[PDB]
């Protein structure tokens, strides 16, 4: 008897941790990604301009 | 200057790489990392020439003159997009996440606590 | 001092430096010969011990010294030496056998 | 003696041309870990010289470190990236083998010259192990490191 | 005083490790250790030929490795971080780092702030 | 040129601090305004290099404010070559740390003499 109560409890908060981390995590990352990727472009842009007046002023 | 953190990002980033891109980001990470600290260093303009002594004191003032007005006329643009619509993709990728992940997630979990309720005994 | 003494120190202190590696290398070949040809033996002797392991065996009626012949190229039969005397009192018996002079 | 101690200051660069690279049969003649320069410093000079070279320096006497330790023990022993890096710090000695223009007498060779970039792209080469599947001998006595890759080639 | 003492001191008995202990020789603990932080200290103050410094970078990183934030790292890659770091905190924490400045000492919040900079930041160095 | 160095009275001890950006030295031989530090050391081992951080350093204080600690720097070059000091001299200008900035060169050509005034010289100016 006692075994199988105790092996349910356990896979059930087992598959409802899982379920709503996989969940949880993506939100943020993902938000997390969007703006690491509008950065990475927008770095160079200031870069190179800031550059040009530089390069020709020389 | 051009970036920014959005949400959390330089460390939450890189530990995280959707499989239809994971390995890229790990390899894009670093190269960020290397325009980022490289940027922040430079000038961002030089200073504009003291015309007033190099004028008066450059005695060849005709092609000196010449010359300012051709730089002083001097128009600049600026650099080109290429890499952008992934800003854009970005919102598709977006739903992709949450509501194609969300909603059947959550259908999913709907059934593991309803299950929950007969398994406390 | 002087130089000479000096020298006279340098001497041997070169001379050294060469017997010592003479020395070191020589024992080093020995060594490192010693250790590879200990394999199969590493093995063997390892083996040796097959249920001595499983089972020792207890006496309370054997020590016996086991160094080379030489040494104070290191204190290495110092430490056997050590360990010979402090087991003689321990023991029984104590007729030792010695191996290595 | 003071004066080459003051000539130290005269000396900026320094040549110490050595019997072992010549013993090694190795015309050039030269150690590198005296070749040097007081302005041969990276932040002085630069690393690409200096590091690059510290690398090969590391390599060549990380490699007489394990000189010794082969001194005894034959090449088997080591980890393979030592051996390798033995046969390429090697190469890279042969590499330097140079032959002479001015003394066909004594080489039986045209000599050779290096362009600098070339050289070390070459040990950039042999340091990325590129070649070191090839002849290491074939590093002897060659100009470009081409001409070195060229030699191997023509062997294996 | 409150990074260095620890630290001179540290350096001063890591200097006597690396004087007698291990290079050949014993493994205590201790010891090692004094010498795994030590040698990262010895990085630390290792300092490259035409890199002056402001005062409280120097403390900030100091007081870094001083509170043993490195052993946990290998000497090399304290140098990358450090730059990064540093550029970071001038930065952002510039503010923190403005402060430090200005109280000429660093305080208790700071630590934690600073701290968390750093092992953040760290924990960026790393991942 | 040969002006006396005061008294006790006429003079006063440090509580002045000073500062190289090099982490090693302000802490661990921090030092102050006054002293005389001896700098040994050899072939360009950055042995000059390290006065030069030093005073490229205080650079940010002559930009600072910090006049009270104004620290006019006079590197008396004794011996260093034309060249050599063509090195050190452009990369100061560089730095333009010359501003604040007196460098007495007797080159290593020099009439003795000269060379042996010249940090007396060096002195008065600082003085």
Known sequence: QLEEVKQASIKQIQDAIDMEKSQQALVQKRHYLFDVQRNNIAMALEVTYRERLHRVYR | RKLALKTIDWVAFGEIIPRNQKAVANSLKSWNETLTSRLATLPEKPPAIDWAYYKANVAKAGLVDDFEKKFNALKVPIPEDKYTAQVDAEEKEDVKSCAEFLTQSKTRIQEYEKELEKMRN | ?101 | DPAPATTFAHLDATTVLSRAIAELGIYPAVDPLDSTSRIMDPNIVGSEHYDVARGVQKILQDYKSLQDIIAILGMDELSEEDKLTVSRARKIQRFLSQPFQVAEVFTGHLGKLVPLKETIKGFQQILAGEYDHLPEQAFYMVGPIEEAVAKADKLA | KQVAGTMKLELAQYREVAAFAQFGSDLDAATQQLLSRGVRLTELLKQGQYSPMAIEEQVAVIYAGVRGYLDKLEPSKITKFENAFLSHVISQHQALLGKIRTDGKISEESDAKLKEIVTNFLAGFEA | VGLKAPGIIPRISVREPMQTGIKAVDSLVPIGRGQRELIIGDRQTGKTSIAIDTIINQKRFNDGTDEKKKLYCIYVAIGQKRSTVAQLVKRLTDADAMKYTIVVSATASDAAPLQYLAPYSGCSMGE
């Open chain 3, 1 to 101: 001092a002087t130089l000479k003494d000096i020298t006279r120190r340098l001497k041997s202190i070169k001379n050294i430096q060469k017997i010592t590696k003479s020395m070191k290398m020589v024992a080093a070949a020995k060594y490192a010969r010693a250790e590879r040809e200990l394999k199969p033996a590493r093995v063997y002797g390892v083996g040796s011990l097959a249920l001595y392991e499983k089972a020792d065996i207890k006496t309370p009626e054997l020590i016996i010294g086991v160094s080379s012949d030489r040494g104070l190229c290191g204190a290495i039969h110092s430490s056997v030496a050590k360990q010979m005397k402090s087991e003689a009192a321990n023991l029984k018996e104590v007729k030792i056998i010695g191996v290595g002079d």
